[PDB]
Amino acid sequence: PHEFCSQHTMLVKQGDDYVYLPYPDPSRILGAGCFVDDIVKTDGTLMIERFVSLAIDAYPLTKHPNQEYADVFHLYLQYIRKLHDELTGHMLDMYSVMLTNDNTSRYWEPEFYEAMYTPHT
RNA sequence: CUGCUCCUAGCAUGCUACUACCGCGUAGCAUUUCCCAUG
């Protein structure tokens, strides 16, 4: 369908055959990233799960024919990474201690996002 | 306000695996043992 619940339907190849993936408009995602209330996202170092949640809905933009949408997805990934590492520096240096296990690598590789659409859970 | 999802924490549940010692079951086993008159 051309549009349903503000989701554009795209058909791509997943696994061994083809399935439909609903992808959102890009402008809405970028606007939600840019403009917010105060402190809710005035400094993302305080709150990172926002962009994690945002990226999950931006994943089907990767399989789009035009590449700008994949660029948006990768931009979100890079920003998540930069936020996480700068948070690590801020916390480790001028405080005492942060890290014994990372467990946070997963949030910058498309393996975790793609599992969101795997027909098994 | 309804619906979906994520993360964290906690709780509780189930499951698995490990160790531990205990108890119980089982085998090998080392062991340590000597027969005699008669319807």
Side-chain angles (χ1 to χ4, degrees), chain A residues 44-78:
Chain A
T45 83
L46 311 170
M47 272 175 78
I48 312 185
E49 28 188 10
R50 297 191 72 258
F51 297 84
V52 163
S53 291
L54 287 199
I56 301 189
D57 281 348
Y59 174 70
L61 282 190
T62 302
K63 321 295 177 57
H64 194 278
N66 170 271
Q67 91 299 331
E68 268 100 326
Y69 313 148
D71 309 342
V72 158
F73 178 76
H74 296 107
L75 179 135
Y76 272 9
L77 258 72
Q78 295 166 31

Side-chain angles (χ1 to χ4, degrees), chain A residues 10-40 42-82:
Chain A
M10 191 178 53
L11 167 66
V12 290
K13 175 86 165 41
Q14 187 192 25
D16 59 337
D17 64 318
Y18 300 86
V19 285
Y20 296 98
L21 261 70
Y23 71 94
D25 180 283
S27 181
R28 198 255 189 271
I29 301 304
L30 264 186
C34 285
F35 305 96
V36 284
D37 318 330
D38 194 9
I39 314 174
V40 175
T42 316
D43 170 73
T45 83
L46 311 170
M47 272 175 78
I48 312 185
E49 28 188 10
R50 297 191 72 258
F51 297 84
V52 163
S53 291
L54 287 199
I56 301 189
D57 281 348
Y59 174 70
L61 282 190
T62 302
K63 321 295 177 57
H64 194 278
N66 170 271
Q67 91 299 331
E68 268 100 326
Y69 313 148
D71 309 342
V72 158
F73 178 76
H74 296 107
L75 179 135
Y76 272 9
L77 258 72
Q78 295 166 31
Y79 197 61
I80 287 179
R81 176 57 151 282
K82 198 261 284 185

